[PDB]
Amino acid sequence: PKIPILKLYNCLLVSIQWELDDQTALTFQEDLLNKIYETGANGVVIDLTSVDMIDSFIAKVLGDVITMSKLMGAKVVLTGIQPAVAVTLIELGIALEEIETALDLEQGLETLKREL
Amino acid sequence: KIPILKLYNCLLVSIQWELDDQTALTFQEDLLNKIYETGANGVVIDLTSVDMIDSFIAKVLGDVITMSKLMGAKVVLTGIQPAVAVTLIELGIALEEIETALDLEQGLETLKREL
């Protein structure tokens, strides 16, 4: 079940809306970077509003895809992190300081535009 | 399930899968619910990645557009492929009422302009 990526002008929009799977997150990390490279988008906003909990594997995947996307030249934003997910990100801890984070998808896109 | 994004007062659904008849009704049921929950005035359905479609799914696509109008939301279809265009015409669903655009951004633009 590939997770979709939306291209809106110069931004990539992602919304995860189900329990993530180790095998799925790896495909998502693989797919997002290709989409950045194929489209040359300036910014990505990843929505985890519908993600109840995550594992350490996903946490590392999520942290790496933020770091990798920035290297390819795209500023990244996370939105909708729930308390359960926030705890696991802190506990590894993949709460990278350079994580620009937002409360909601709209706000993240707003923050994304003002950064650029 | 098919994910649906909410940007301000608009719904963006992109179908990057291969949709069977089972998924289409799930989509129809979920989209009409999403409008009612969100209070969205417009929705953009991107069919750019849909290689082909069948007559049954064609019909649900036409019903979704017309049903969402009744709820008060405007529907724009984007990225329809030639193969899909043949099937849509074949059923006769293709009406002047269907508002359509080439890609998601143009479809979203057409939406804001008419609201």
Numbering used by the authors:
A (entry chain A): 4 to 119
B (entry chain B): 5 to 119
Please share text taken word for word from the publication where this structure appeared.
The stressosome transduces environmental stress signals to SigB to upregulate SigB-dependent transcription, which is required for bacterial viability. The stressosome core is composed of RsbS and at least one of the RsbR paralogs. Unlike the RsbR proteins, RsbS only contains an STAS domain. Here, an assembly model of the stressosome is presented based on the crystal structure of the RsbS icosahedron and cryo-EM structures of the RsbRA–RsbS complex determined under diverse symmetry restraints (nonsymmetric C1, dihedral D2 and icosahedral I envelopes).
Cubic crystals belonging to space group I23 were grown under diverse precipitant conditions, such as NaCl, ethanol and polyethylene glycol 8000. Diffraction data were collected to 3.1 Å resolution. Thus, the structure of RsbS was determined by the single-wavelength anomalous dispersion (SAD) method using a crystal of selenomethionine-labeled RsbS. In addition, a β-strand at the N-terminus (β0) interacted with β1 in the manner of an antiparallel β-sheet. In a structural comparison using DALI, RsbS showed high structural similarity to mtSTAS and to Geobacillus stearothermophilus SpoIIAB (gsSpoIIAB), both of which are agonists of antisigma factors. mtSTAS and gsSpoIIAB superimposed onto RsbS with RMSD values of 1.6 and 1.9 Å for 112 Cα positions, respectively [Fig. 1(c)], indicating that RsbS has the conserved fold of the STAS domain. The RsbS crystal contains five monomers in the asymmetric unit. Interface 1 was associated with the formation of the asymmetric unit. A pentameric ring in the asymmetric unit was formed by tandem ‘head-to-tail’ interactions of five RsbS monomers [Fig. 2(b)]. A surface area of 663 Å2 was buried in the binding interface. Interface 2 mediated the interaction between two RsbS pentamers generated by crystallographic symmetry [Fig. 2(b)].
